[PDB]
Design a protein around this ligand. Sequence first.
Ligand SMILES: CC/C(=N\OC/C=C/Cl)C1=C(O)C[C@H](C2CCOCC2)CC1=O
Ligand SMILES: CC/C(=N\OC/C=C/Cl)C1=C(O)C[C@H](C2CCOCC2)CC1=O
Lengths: 688, 688
Amino acid sequence: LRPIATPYPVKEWLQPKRYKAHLMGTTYVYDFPELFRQASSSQWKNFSADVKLTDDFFISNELIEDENGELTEVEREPGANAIGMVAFKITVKTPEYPRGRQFVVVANDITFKIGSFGPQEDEFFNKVTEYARKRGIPRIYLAANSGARIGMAEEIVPLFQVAWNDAANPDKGFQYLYLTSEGMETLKKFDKENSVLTERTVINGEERFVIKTIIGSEDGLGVECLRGSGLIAGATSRAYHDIFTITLVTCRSVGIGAYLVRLGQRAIQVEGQPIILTGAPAINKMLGREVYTSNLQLGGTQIMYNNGVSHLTAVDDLAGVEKIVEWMSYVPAKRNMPVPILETKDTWDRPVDFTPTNDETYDVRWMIEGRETESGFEYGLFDKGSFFETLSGWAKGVVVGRARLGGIPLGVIGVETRTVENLIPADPANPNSAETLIQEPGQVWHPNSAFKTAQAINDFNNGEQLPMMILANWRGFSGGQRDMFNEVLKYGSFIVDALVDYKQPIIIYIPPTGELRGGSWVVVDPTINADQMEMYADVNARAGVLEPQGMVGIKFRREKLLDTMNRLDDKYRELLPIYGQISLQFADLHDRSSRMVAKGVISKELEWTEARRFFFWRLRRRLNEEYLIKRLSHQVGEASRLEKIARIRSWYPASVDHEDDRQVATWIEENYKTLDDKLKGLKLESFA
Amino acid sequence: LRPIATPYPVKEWLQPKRYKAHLMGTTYVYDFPELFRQASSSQWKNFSADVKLTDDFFISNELIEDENGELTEVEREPGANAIGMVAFKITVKTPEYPRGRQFVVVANDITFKIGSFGPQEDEFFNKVTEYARKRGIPRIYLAANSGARIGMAEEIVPLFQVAWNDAANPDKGFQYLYLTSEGMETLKKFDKENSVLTERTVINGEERFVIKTIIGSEDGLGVECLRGSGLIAGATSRAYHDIFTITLVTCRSVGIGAYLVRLGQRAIQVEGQPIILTGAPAINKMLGREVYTSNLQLGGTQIMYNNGVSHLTAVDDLAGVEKIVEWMSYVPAKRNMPVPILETKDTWDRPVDFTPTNDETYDVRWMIEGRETESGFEYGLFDKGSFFETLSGWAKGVVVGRARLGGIPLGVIGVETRTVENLIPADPANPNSAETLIQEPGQVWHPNSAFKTAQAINDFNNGEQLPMMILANWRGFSGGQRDMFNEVLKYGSFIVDALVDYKQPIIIYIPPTGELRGGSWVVVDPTINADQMEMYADVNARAGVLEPQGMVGIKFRREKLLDTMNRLDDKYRELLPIYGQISLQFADLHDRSSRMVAKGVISKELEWTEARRFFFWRLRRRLNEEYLIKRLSHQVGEASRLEKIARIRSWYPASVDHEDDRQVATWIEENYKTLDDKLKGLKLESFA
Ligand SMILES: CC/C(=N\OC/C=C/Cl)C1=C(O)C[C@H](C2CCOCC2)CC1=O
Ligand SMILES: CC/C(=N\OC/C=C/Cl)C1=C(O)C[C@H](C2CCOCC2)CC1=O
């Protein structure tokens, strides 16, 4: 029976599966929508304390297969699921979508056959994924599983005979397994003749049916589970390019489960819940020794968070759900809808306060989100409280997250200026290899941080469909033996490929005290994707092929130095020190934003304190023009980007200055319908 | 003067740039087309010794910018190039294209400003790339360079003054650099007022013009070289997805040069010619010690071939050119043309001879290309002499190359069954880290071999546009700490993504003695890309979620064993050994190709000796049906794959068996024009 005198019903007794989930250290699958209700109520409170929510602000409807295999909504008692995979359609009013947004949640039921994936779970997971893709809606996956289902044909276990070499002495081997005439009958009786493929023989007067293959009557034993897993692996690969995908790992995720985490890309790992290919015991078998003590050694957050497989960790399920909900607050309600604007108290119209200084170490997050000080808050570039960092466990040379600029959500990449101390632990499989410490100097792309940069760019583009700002401040790629060996060329090239593919406005901005040198400029140059990319440089930024020291070593050598002493020391070599300094200054004078403007390689030089104002209206004006470019592209007879943007601009009143971001933005927003009428009349002119 | 009494003119004297190239250990750029003439003549001789070639079998025309910047053909004397980048259009009759195929070669001129990339070289390289892309033609790049051009404004060097803190003692610092009234005049005289940005001041009665920024009059100093490099980086990124791209590294390739090698992907590195980001001296500066002795330590073949950055090494320029020419013999003449069929003496109609054996180590290349023995040649699956292995320096657990099947070119991936001993050398930058040996057991995907597999799939798809066969034989992904830490989940997921993107027929075939277990099946399951993928299993292959040993450990435990002794030992525990064997055999009986067929997860089970015949006609029939599917897709009102293939099949005569590959192929080829007439009549029915 139950725990006896509680004021309200014992949930874990009414539905013992709920208690089974709790014993495995996870939330019961039918209790997840309530976690999402809690997390969404909280985001309302964080946004506007006085807002009054009805219960119909949050709706969760279970999705199941109908009689024709099609997904429909039902309301049923928890634990009625006849398969180990479950889904809900969620309709929720949020700050960014006060009239409602929708997404699907799919989840393993760790209580149903240990949350294993059989062909039915695979087909359902694939239908849910397709259901989301068709509607353009996000797909959240809650991973709590033991991977592919495995089995043998249990009905053949008590039936099979051995054909011994010597009936007297078994120990000397056997020739095959077979069924008797009675075995074949038990199978016919139970309508399971298919379970084996046999070949009739006769030895010593009576019939043997040699087992050539065991098939089994139960679905879900072997290769049919492999097929089902490939199906959902490919389904998820495609989903990532199509809709917002994210996964929360909540008890463990095994095999196909672990790949699904990676294939959906965006992953949050609850502390102590491993992401693994196989368990430690199974691996230890093979290896012949007790090499590993736990699954957490193979797939704990100290592996996957440190890897970049897990974008975030969470202390518990609810924290994980809060993170999902916060991550989606930057993301359009569905594919191709505009990005969700959310103005808060920190409005566009203010200077930027926190400012880095040449001789003084800073955390780049201060420039991004601002900084708390003894004398008050110093505001950064982006809206106060809006910075949501991800991939924070991995390749800490770069910092990536979401933020809002006067309400406009965007992806943000910045450069960590402090040296990173990367601790690689020993693998207990190498009798004694040791812990190794990697030093990663600031403002240098290593293979890991190059990969992270490309990954961020892809993750902003693909489901999030965000504009992006990169606060570019790299002194170059590392060219030393180890990093070259570890394929820095490949990871650096991933960045160019990610930019080519980018579909929303991009701003590259070299910040004050910052620099962009050589290859590190190249990889981010706006001619990579001129349709989307624009570059800016602070008046206190630097750029050129080399730093002054490197430049002097090639083009201001001792000959040229002495010639220059010869030219303005009347006496003319304890002059070297100061004369070197002079050559260094001579080089630095080429590296200024004024030269960048003169050569036409940046859109504008800017002042940091005015950047927030400038970028807000530049972005807002770009979002508006992009929108019109796309409307124009949906006509019948199509053209270049140059032709489209020129024609849209020809619709602006003659007096409007095409260069005035605010003016252009304000006039478009006053005139959307009028521009729409103009588009309608062009379609009625595109049969020819 | 010259070396004096030679029978013919001294080329290196008539054009001293030719000698300059030779001194730098490379072929002179205008002598490369002659290398391609040599290599193409040789491929004719290797193919058919008695074929008689005219000189018009090979044509090389230089491409240059005309007066309006457009590329045209000219004939001029070598060394007339006014920029350091050169290109040729090549028209060549080859065995696969006896009437001619074309491609462009672009190359740095290592003799022109040390082969550095300035804005003019970048714009030209970008025009050549676009010229090739427009025509769909391959783009070959010959890399011999020193990276981006660097400079200072030399005209300001003899003109600038220092504003000392104390005119008597320089050693105590300065305040700025400035020009006199006479400096400003020299600049006005030479029409170079733009070279500096100045601010007029007056100190002690006469005018100082403070240098605020040095611009310089010479193009090619700083950020304009960065812009030009980004342009060509993005141009090359796009080319790889569009046309066949390959690069040969011939003296050195530096900076943007090294990235261009990676971005074009397919790379052949001449021995002793480094691929680097910076030189050892420049790196040694920074580090404060003499850490590196040569560029070859940073970017020699022992780094880049071992990395997979270099797909092949070559002993000299000519060997490199032979490899390019051989690599392109598998590749369509231009984008979207059919793959080039080249039947040789080894015709489709024969059994496969070399056969692996369960207890006996083999080289998988024997199954692919066949094997020379004491008693004669044992033929493999593919045409004798047709196997062209690539990425052979890296991740040797997988083997990738091109081959031909009865004349049909295709990409091939196989599994190296022998343990690989991977030697990672120490980096001389870590005071004493040591050489480390990695053991890579056969038939296991590690991060490196997973990456290599995905890379191969991409490289077959993108410019080569090849069908592919994978001889799938993996026992699983490695799930140990080190490989999990090193992100095996990410690389394994690259494979699924590559397959989703694949545009030509794929065959997956588990060979005899081979197996596909768990995750390793999943990643290659045809439901990943059902439009293109088909799976087959040899009658002597195995597959399931786990190997028998692993399966027994979970589902045939001691309880079940003893129950089974209890069932057929009359006496009923020195029976364990044989009874374990019995359970192992019980598991193995589930893992057979007969179960695969019963569950519907493979197209067919096959016999190895008959595979070449079977796959030849299956592929040939797929190439034909694909062709028709595409013709049908180019009509006005479009539909699913199911609908298209069904309609094409409805055109076959009623008596044709849709399942007979040879019959279907033979009837389509007899009827291309008749099918074309049928397509014409459907267009004249697709206005509605
Ligand atoms: C400016 C392009 C670039 N790399 O782009 C990497 C490409 C990323 Cl797509 C690059 C160079 O070409 C040569 C530069 C140095 C000049 C003087 O000799 C030492 C080398 C260093 C440098 O960083
Ligand atoms: C069959 C899918 C798969 N991985 O696919 C990786 C996914 C690639 Cl895209 C996979 C599993 O799910 C669980 C398997 C074991 C079953 C018993 O407990 C130990 C684990 C091992 C395995 O290999």
